[PDB]
Amino acid sequence: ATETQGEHTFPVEVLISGEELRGYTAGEALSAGEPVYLSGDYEVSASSADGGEFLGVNLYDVASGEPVALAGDDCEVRVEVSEQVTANDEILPDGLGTFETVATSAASAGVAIVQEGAASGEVCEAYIFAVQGTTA
Amino acid sequence: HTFPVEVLISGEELRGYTAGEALSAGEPVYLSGDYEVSASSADGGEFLGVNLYDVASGEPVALAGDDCEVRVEVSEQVTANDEILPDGLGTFETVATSAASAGVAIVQEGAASGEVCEAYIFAVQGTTA
Amino acid sequence: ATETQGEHTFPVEVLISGEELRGYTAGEALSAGEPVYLSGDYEVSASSADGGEFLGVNLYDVASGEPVALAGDDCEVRVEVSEQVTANDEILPDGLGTFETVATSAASAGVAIVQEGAASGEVCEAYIFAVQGTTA
Amino acid sequence: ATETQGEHTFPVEVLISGEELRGYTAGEALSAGEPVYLSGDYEVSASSADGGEFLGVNLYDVASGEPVALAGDDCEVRVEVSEQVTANDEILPDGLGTFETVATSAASAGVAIVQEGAASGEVCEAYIFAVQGTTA
Amino acid sequence: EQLLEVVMEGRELRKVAREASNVINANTRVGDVPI
Amino acid sequence: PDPSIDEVSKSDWDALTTQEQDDIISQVENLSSTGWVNTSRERKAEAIRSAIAERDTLYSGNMSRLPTLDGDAEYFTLYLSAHKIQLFEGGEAQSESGEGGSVSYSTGGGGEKDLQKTRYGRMALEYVWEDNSIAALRTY
Amino acid sequence: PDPSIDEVSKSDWDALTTQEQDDIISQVENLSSTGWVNTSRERKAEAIRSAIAERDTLYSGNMSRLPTLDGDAEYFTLYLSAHKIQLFEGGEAQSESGEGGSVSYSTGGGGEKDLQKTRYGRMALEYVWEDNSIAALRTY
Amino acid sequence: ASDEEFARPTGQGAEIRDDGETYTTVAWNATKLTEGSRVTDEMRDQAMV
Amino acid sequence: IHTILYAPNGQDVEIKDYEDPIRDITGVNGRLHVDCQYSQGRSSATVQY
Amino acid sequence: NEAAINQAIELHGFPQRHVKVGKEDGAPVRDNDLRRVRTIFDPRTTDANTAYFTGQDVDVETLEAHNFDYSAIHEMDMRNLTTALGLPLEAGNVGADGLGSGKPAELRFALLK
Amino acid sequence: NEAAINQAIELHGFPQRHVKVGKEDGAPVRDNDLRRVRTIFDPRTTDANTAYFTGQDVDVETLEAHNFDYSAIHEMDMRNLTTALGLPLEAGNVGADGLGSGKPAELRFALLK
Amino acid sequence: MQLRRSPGMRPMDRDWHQERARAREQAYSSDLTSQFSESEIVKYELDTAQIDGSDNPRTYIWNRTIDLFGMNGTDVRELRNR
Amino acid sequence: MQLRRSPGMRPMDRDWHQERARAREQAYSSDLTSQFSESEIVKYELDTAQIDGSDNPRTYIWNRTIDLFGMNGTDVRELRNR
Ligand SMILES: [K+]
Ligand SMILES: [K+]
Ligand SMILES: [K+]
Ligand SMILES: [K+]
Ligand SMILES: [Mg+2]
Ligand SMILES: [Mg+2]
Ligand SMILES: [Mg+2]
Ligand SMILES: [Mg+2]
Ligand SMILES: [Mg+2]
Ligand SMILES: [Mg+2]
Ligand SMILES: [Mg+2]
Ligand SMILES: [Mg+2]
Ligand SMILES: [Mg+2]
Ligand SMILES: [Mg+2]
Ligand SMILES: [Mg+2]
């Protein structure tokens, strides 16, 4: 996720507010702003689509096996979306390193609420409010 | 008119928004534009927190979010462990009464219809379709 | 919940991380690491099975009518499980002082997610992300 | 009653001239420049629409039961008229907190005489020269 | 009132890596040694 | 009853069907062995409507942060209703005498104030701290 | 009733239609099981008019900024009307006796003041702080 | 304070008339403006600036 | 035209640096309360295109 | 003891206003009623020469400053500490009966020297 | 005796607040009801000029600081100990009456020498 | 002539400022009629004061029924991140 | 995080030591329910203390109804042959 200032492009700063920042081992290479889920004991990997796989968003780029910092629920974040989102949309991982709306997905409930809208392929601002694991 | 007041019991989770309409202390609100909050409707697509203090339309507003403990008016009788959500009338009501299946706050002090209960806000609700 | 070190049994430190500590009255005698729910006005008792009854875990042993400290949601905790659990499993109060998986319970949603897998009777590490009350 | 000066609204100074001020008790809430009459022992209330109810004009805003200052007769006052008035017109309480002319009222004699004419809803200057009470 | 102001220690592990290896006090968290 | 007497405010009672009201009336009539069968429906309805209104206005709010209505709100409203019906009947009978048969009851000098004056009122009074003033408040 | 008894002042009562007055009269008659049927309409009207007048003059205004009529204004005015009608019939019957039997009621040692002197008065009295004097003011 | 006005023509011995200074107010309501940022200790250490 | 600054702690504008020892982060937070009001809006004119 | 004294001074060294509302055995007063009373009798916004007008059923009581001899506790603490450290009590800004003059002074200053 | 005094000062040297709740012979108050009264009158969050507004049925009583002459107990202890060790009482930072002047001073200083 | 209570003079009175400042600090709502005397609302023109309870310190103070951590009495606008 | 009452911290608490010593000197038997509050039994883990009445001085002190010889108040574990 990147911001343009005329000539220049800058890295988007993933975190806006919140202190619920937690440490894990990366199960694979990951990028700032990617949604992730538990793939092993204290190990996180990129979320697939349609729920049951979300612990937080990765805060900075990591290679496989590196320690990684993650923003959980109670955090307010800048994240890239797969589609147009509007204020009050619930969103969750699209399986493509980015978020989509609950309304578009096969899931019934999301993990973050959109606070500032965005176009497709663009950065929204969202508050993370839930985690999703394996329920069977 | 009536007055639920001194709405914050405990909690650090206050966030700033723009009021999309005139709002009152303890009123449940939801997102209605980019960082704009308005009063919640009745059946569970629409909650972010409760407004701390009375505000006019367009003013900056302090919103008590989840992880936060609040005094709120309930439109019906509630008891400890009841889940509640916005009622569409500035009040809360139980999940049991509503068309919804999940709440946004857990009742910690029981209350009669039209009285103030004490609740812990634990979730938010948006547009799922 | 106990480490063994030679002759010695050491109680495990229940609360791994989190600032979400709150005080309640004991509705009955309770022991460290039990899941509890609101049994009355600011009063907590041990959770039964199959959901609708969870506020946090008790942090210390109490008689009935004493003040109780809870770890609520937003906390990470060391808790005993009654069955094998694995990372990403959602877990739920078991009615027995333990937790069990959502998959084993009659419920459809959990209250904590397992970060560190454990066998039956062992100490798991888990993150508490939700509370459950009477929805009818 | 009001002057406008740019953004600002200024209250008019009600009493122009006169030394005969007297203190009464408010029988109801009253506002500066309202005509009032005796309604109990040393108690004044807002004048009704025709003759027989005028002791003076209230000089400042009051709640019920507060002490009131009156400008009585022998005073010159800035007062709002509900209709267009001219110099030499006798005027009378209107029942609406304003004055109106004797000519417009059902009465036959006034309580003040206009010295400086005004439009409807506008501040005239008038000399208060008589009181009126219950004659039957 | 009189009381033992003592705590008996747990097991203590042997610590050797600072002596038993070449130690680099790095200026940066990430870096390179050329070979 | 389907809507219980504690679920309804004064405006709700007016909005109920006659059957929903009759269910609540029938529950109130359980509180006397006589059922007050010689008092007409309109009077039992007036008593219940009044008890609802009086609960919501005189026996509502908090003391410290405790609810003023501490007991079960259902049974409080029913006892408050029975109190009113019994006063519409003229009060507690202290004694009744008929065709040679006679009875006297231990009502006694139970008190001067409204709820003290009948058995139903004395029951209702225990639900609401016995009308005691345990409220406290602070500056910060 | 369509205009409620709490929505009318003394001058409004005089302006109501005979039916609007009769609706309020009918509501007041629900507060006694006998309905005071042997007392004429003019007397029931006078009692209601007087209760409205007395509410607006003796049981109005504020007391430490609290409303002095703390309970429901409807039921207060009705109980104040019922109190007056009962006093027009000579007061509380403490005991009644005849061919049909005898009864004695637990009225007891009721206090000196008028509202204490009937059951309706004692009910009305709870709506108005039990006539307590909790007013307070300060100098600014 | 109200605007500056004019004195009026007057007779000898005639009562002078009151044109006293009258006042109004402009209200203020100071809004809380805020800004924030965070840096890790590692980043604080390693940066050239 | 008046810029009105409110300082609950007397200092005109408050910039704080603080450490989080639980996360090893330094935060830099700025706050101010400000309003602006004319005393006489008549004392000014906009030039309009 | 210093911490205990400092805490007790805040709690007990100053009088505190206790407004009691309602008649004894009268009508009960609820929390939202006391919210009005708290606005009227607010100490934080009271002038020295404020006057009050009430009905009979309002009582402005005082929690008096409950006297305890904190000075004697300080003198005792300072005696214990100065003697423990071998200093004369005078070093602690605390005086003593009889000890300030004559041979009693000559001894304690000899011990110090 | 030093330990006994120190503990007695902790318990009795400072006043303590006793809030009594409910009317005498009225409705009983349970532990969960007192928990809310404790929140109001908590000394941990009270300050010097805090004020309280209540119904008639809350009584703010005080355990007074219960007087005892700990100074006289210390003087006795020090007299015992100093005389037992043969030192003059003055060495203990404790004064005396009549002994500080004239031939009474001359004797005790002669005995020490 | 202008009295101390007269409408054009209220802004000169020290008490009009002091009492409006008190009213803002004491308030728990914009609903003045709930809380203030008819005298206060008239005498201090409290309709014109921006009263809403946002200036009352107790709007921001924690007062939980059981406190094991000494959190009560803390004012949230005195925290690090405010 | 660990609180004073937390199970791993009890042996650090001075009061847990002092109060277990008190409990041993109070008792006449191992039956804790007969002698201690249920709060004390949990808070001080009195199940794990060797409470049996053998440490209570009153177990060993003589206290006959009538005493002509000043025997009462002697402690048997302070005699010559003990
Ligand atoms: K899809
Ligand atoms: K509904
Ligand atoms: K099961
Ligand atoms: K006319
Ligand atoms: Mg936050
Ligand atoms: Mg949270
Ligand atoms: Mg954390
Ligand atoms: Mg003149
Ligand atoms: Mg490299
Ligand atoms: Mg109770
Ligand atoms: Mg009330
Ligand atoms: Mg002029
Ligand atoms: Mg002018
Ligand atoms: Mg009463
Ligand atoms: Mg009882």
Helices (H), chain C: none
Contact A131, A72 (CB under 8 A): yes
Contact A36, A73 (CB under 8 A): no
Query: Which chain E residues touch H if contact means CB-CB below 8 Å?
Result: 27-29
Q: What angle do CA B80, B84, B87 make, to 5 degrees?
A: 140
> What is the least distance, in Å, from the CA of H29 to any CA of chain D?
18
Please state, in angstroms and rounded to a whole number, the distance separating the CA atoms of residues J89 and J72.
14
Instruction: Tell whether G133 lies on the interface with J, counting CB pairs under 8 A.
Output: yes
Listed residue (A87, A75, A82) closest to A114, CA to CA: A87
Please state, in angstroms and rounded to a whole number, the distance separating the CA atoms of residues F54 and I24.
60
Helix (H/G/I), strand (E/B), else coil: C51:
coil
Show which of residues 12-51 on chain F sit within 8 Å of chain L, judged by CB atoms: none
Please state, in angstroms and rounded to a whole number, the distance separating the CA atoms of residues C3 and F28.
61
Per the DSSP assignment, residues forming a β-bridge with B64 are B14, B50
Locate G109 and state its tokens: 């040692």
Of A20, A38, A72, the CB nearest to C87: A38
Q: What angle do CA I22, B15, B29 make, to 5 degrees?
A: 140
Please state, in angstroms and rounded to a whole number, the distance separating the CA atoms of residues M71 and D22.
97
Contact state of L81 with I16 under an 8 Å Cβ cutoff:
no
Query: Which chain L residues touch K if contact means CB-CB below 8 Å?
Result: 63-67, 70, 72-73
Q: What angle do CA B81, B82, B87 make, to 5 degrees?
A: 150
CA separation (Å) from A66 to A25, A33, E7, E30? 6, 16, 38, 12
SS3 content of chain M, % helix, strand, coil (to 5): 40, 0, 60
- Count of CB atoms within 10 A of residue B101's CB? 11
**Which residues of chain F are within 8 Å of residue K55 when distances are taken between CB atoms?**
63, 132-136
**Which residues of chain L are within 8 Å of residue B118 when distances are taken between CB atoms?**
65
Q: What is the DSSP string of B32-62?
A: EETTEEEE--SSSS-BSEEESS-B-TTSEEE
Contact A118, A135 (CB under 8 A): no
Helix (H/G/I), strand (E/B), else coil: C108:
coil
Please state, in angstroms and rounded to a whole number, the distance separating the CA atoms of residues F61 and F59.
7
To probe the interface with D, which of H5, H16, H17 has the most D CB atoms within 10 Å?
H17
Nearest CA in chain F to J28: F133
Q: How far apart are the first and last CA of chain L?
A: 49
Please state, in angstroms and rounded to a whole number, the distance separating the CA atoms of residues J90 and J96.
8
Instruction: Tell whether C38 lies on the interface with K, counting CB pairs under 8 A.
Output: no
Chains contacting M (3 or more CB pairs within 8 Å): C, E
Contact K50, C59 (CB under 8 A): no
> What is the least distance, in Å, from the CA of L45 to any CA of chain F?
25
Q: What is the DSSP letter of D44?
A: E
CA dihedral in degrees (G103, G106, G108, G112; nearest 10)? -100
Contact state of B127 with A74 under an 8 Å Cβ cutoff:
no
Show which of residues 4-63 on chain D sit within 8 Å of chain L, judged by CB atoms: 10-15, 18, 21, 29, 32, 59-63
Q: Are strands C99-101 and C90-93 parallel, antiparallel or unpaired?
A: antiparallel
* Ligand whose nearest atom lies closest to the CA of F132: 14
To probe the interface with B, which of L25, L29, L60, L72 has the most B CB atoms within 10 Å?
L29
Check the annotation: does B66 bind a ligand: yes
Nearest CA in chain K to C67: K35
Please state, in angstroms and rounded to a whole number, the distance separating the CA atoms of residues C120 and K4.
54
Length of chain J counted residue by residue = 113
**Experimental technique for the deposited model:** cryo-EM
**Which residues of chain L are within 8 Å of residue B14 when distances are taken between CB atoms?**
76
Helices (H), G16-126: 18-29, 41-58, 73-88, 119-126
Q: What is the DSSP string of D57-93?
A: EE-S-B-TTSEEEEE-TT-EEEEEESS-B-TT-EEEE
> What's the one-letter identity of residue L80?
R
Please report which helix (H) or strand (E) contains residue H46, including its range. Answer: helix H41-46
Contact state of F58 with G127 under an 8 Å Cβ cutoff:
yes
Contact state of C116 with A41 under an 8 Å Cβ cutoff:
yes
Longest dimension (CA), chain F: 70
- The dihedral built from the CA positions of residue D77, D83, D88 and D89, taken in this order, carries a sign that is negative
- Count of CB atoms within 10 A of residue E21's CB? 8
Of I24, I27, I31, the CB nearest to H34: I31
Q: What is the DSSP string of L8-48?
A: TTGGG-HHHHHHHHHHHHH-S-S-GGGTS-HHHHHHTTTTT
Q: What is the DSSP string of chain B?
A: -------EEE-S-EEEEEESS-B-TT-EEEEEETTEEEE--SSSS-BSEEESS-B-TTSEEEEE-TTEEEEEEBSS-B-TTBEEEE-SSSSEEETTTSS-S--SEEEEE-B-TTSEEEEEE---B-B--
Rounded distance from Cα C55 to ligand 6 centre (Å)? 13
Contact G123, F124 (CB under 8 A): no
Contact state of L80 with I31 under an 8 Å Cβ cutoff:
no
Check the annotation: does F126 bind a ligand: yes
How many cross-chain Cβ pairs, C to M, lie less than 8 Å apart?
Answer: 41
Helix (H/G/I), strand (E/B), else coil: C91:
strand
Contact state of L35 with G140 under an 8 Å Cβ cutoff:
no
Write out the E strands in chain F: 62-63, 66-67, 93-97, 102-104, 136-138
Please state, in angstroms and rounded to a whole number, the distance separating the CA atoms of residues F95 and F103.
6
Please state, in angstroms and rounded to a whole number, the distance separating the CA atoms of residues M26 and M41.
13
Please report which helix (H) or strand (E) contains residue A99, including its range. Answer: strand A99-101
Q: Which strands sit side by side in the sheet containing C99-101, from one edge to the other?
A: C15-17, C76-80, C123-128, C112-116, C90-93, C99-101
Please state, in angstroms and rounded to a whole number, the distance separating the CA atoms of residues F117 and D135.
54
